[PDB]
């Protein structure tokens, strides 16, 4: 169970927008830290409506199951606040935000070594979840958070974490599912109960495509009906102009779930591309 945080000790500041049936805010948590020292900590607050009981139960279950698995590349959740008007997940605030924005804002500067490092780190996170047989369900660049920028001056590669899973694709409306083509794999579009570890392999592929496409979203030009038809006709994504990961993207995004490679194999492939 999550550590419970008092309503009183959270201040909501700026809106960072809306996610899938969530409102996101930057905030401050008043806390007694190590050594009984009082702290006021920058936090990310994810807000679910109490009235959507099924959605928040799914949201908070998923967040909890993953938070039981501490890892350097998985986002830290400090706890929850349910004593209020709403249900709130209190999470670490990640200084450089989402990868998808960052890729767009710094497209001109990001090169292949940076891309490789970030792909490697995501692959290691996904390896860890695979070993723990925990399905994330919502891997996309948006949900990669940049803890630390690259510093060439000093040799530091960037560092990333993968955010919490959100509401399960088993409980989300069909209409949201179709909107998330091509991250949601074809087998989950025909039946979301086909959700499986193989799901995350497909989405990982889609995320690599984003990582190589400067913040572009695959198939954004296509409406929901045409996205559905794209899977029905078994299309693949175009190779990015930066083609270095094109083969890995296609191998990952295999219409046969059984044939998608393990994350160990994905890591060895990434390592070899040096």
Ligand X SMILES: Nc1ncnc2c1ncn2[C@@H]1O[C@H](COP(=O)(O)OP(=O)(O)OP(=O)(O)O)[C@@H](O)[C@H]1O
Which among 110, 138, 158, 131 has a CA at the least distance from the CA of 46? 138
The residues facing 31 across adjacent strands are: 39
Distance CA 72, CA 49 (A): 30
Residue 185 binds ligand X, judged by CB under 6 A: no
Residue 143 binds Mg ion, judged by CB under 5 A: yes
- Among ligand X, Mg ion, none, partner that 22 touches (CB below 5 to 8 angstroms by kind): ligand X
Q: Give the nearest residue (CB) to Mg ion.
A: 143
Distance CA 251, CA 56 (A): 34
Q: Are 146 and 158 in contact (CB under 8 A)?
A: yes
Which among 54, 80, 42 has a CA at the least distance from the CA of 164? 80
Residue 73 binds ligand X, judged by CB under 6 A: no
Residue 168 binds ligand X, judged by CB under 6 A: no
How close are the terminal C-alpha atoms of the chain, in Å? 42
Comparison of 89 and 198: residue with beta carbon closer to ligand X: 89
CB of 211 to ligand X, least distance (A): 16
Burial of 71 (0-12, 13-18, 19+ CB in 10 A): middle
Return the range that interacts with Mg ion (CB under 5 A); candidates 161-169, 170-178, 236-244, 246-254: 161-169
Q: Are 144 and 122 in contact (CB under 8 A)?
A: yes
Residue 22 binds ligand X, judged by CB under 6 A: yes
CB of 116 to Mg ion, least distance (A): 24
Q: Are 66 and 136 in contact (CB under 8 A)?
A: yes
Comparison of 93 and 128: residue with beta carbon closer to ligand X: 93
Which among 93, 94, 210 has a CA at the least distance from the CA of 149? 94
- How many of the other CB atoms lie within 10 Å of CB of 187? 19
CB of 138 to Mg ion, least distance (A): 7
- Among Mg ion, ligand X, none, partner that 94 touches (CB below 5 to 8 angstroms by kind): ligand X
Comparison of 162 and 252: residue with beta carbon closer to ligand X: 162
Q: What order do you get walking across the sheet with 10-19 strand by strand?
A: 10-19, 22-32, 38-49, 86-92, 77-81
- Among Mg ion, ligand X, none, partner that 98 touches (CB below 5 to 8 angstroms by kind): ligand X
Per-residue binding string, ligand X, 87-126, x by CB under 6 A, is ----xxxx--xx----------------------------
CB of 23 to ligand X, least distance (A): 8
Residue 58 binds ligand X, judged by CB under 6 A: no
Residue 67 binds Mg ion, judged by CB under 5 A: no
Comparison of 23 and 261: residue with beta carbon closer to ligand X: 23
| Interface residue list for Mg ion (CB under 5 A) | 143, 163
């Amino acid at each position: 169970v999550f550590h419970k945080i008092r309503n009183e000790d959270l201040i909501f500041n700026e809106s960072l927008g809306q996610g899938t049936f969530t409102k996101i805010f930057k905030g401050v948590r008043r806390e007694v830290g190590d050594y009984g020292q009082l702290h006021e900590t920058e936090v990310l607050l994810k807000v679910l409506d109490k009235a959507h009981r099924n959605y928040s139960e799914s949201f908070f279950e998923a967040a909890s199951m993953m938070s039981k698995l501490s890892h350097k590349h998985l986002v830290l959740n400090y706890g929850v606040c349910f004593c209020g008007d709403e249900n709130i997940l209190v999470q670490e605030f990640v200084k450089f935000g989402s990868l998808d924005t960052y890729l767009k804002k710094n497209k001109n500067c990001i090169n292949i070594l940076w891309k490789l490092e970030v792909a490697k780190q995501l692959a290691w996170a996904m390896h860890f979840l695979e070993e723990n047989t925990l399905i994330h369900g919502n891997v996309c660049a948006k949900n990669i958070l940049l803890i630390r920028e690259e510093d060439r001056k000093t040799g530091n590669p960037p560092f990333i974490k993968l955010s919490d899973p959100g509401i399960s694709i088993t409980v989300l409306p069909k209409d949201i599912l179709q909107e998330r083509i091509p991250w949601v794999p074809p087998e989950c579009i025909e039946n979301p109960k086909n959700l499986n570890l193989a799901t995350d392999k497909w989405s990982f592929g889609t995320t690599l495509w984003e990582i190589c496409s400067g913040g572009d979203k695959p198939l954004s030009a296509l409406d929901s009906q045409r996205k559905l038809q794209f899977y029905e006709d078994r299309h693949q994504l175009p190779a990015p102009k930066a083609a270095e990961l094109a083969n890995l993207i296609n191998n990952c995004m295999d219409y046969e779930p059984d044939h998608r490679p393990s994350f160990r194999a994905i890591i060895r492939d990434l390592n070899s591309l040096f």
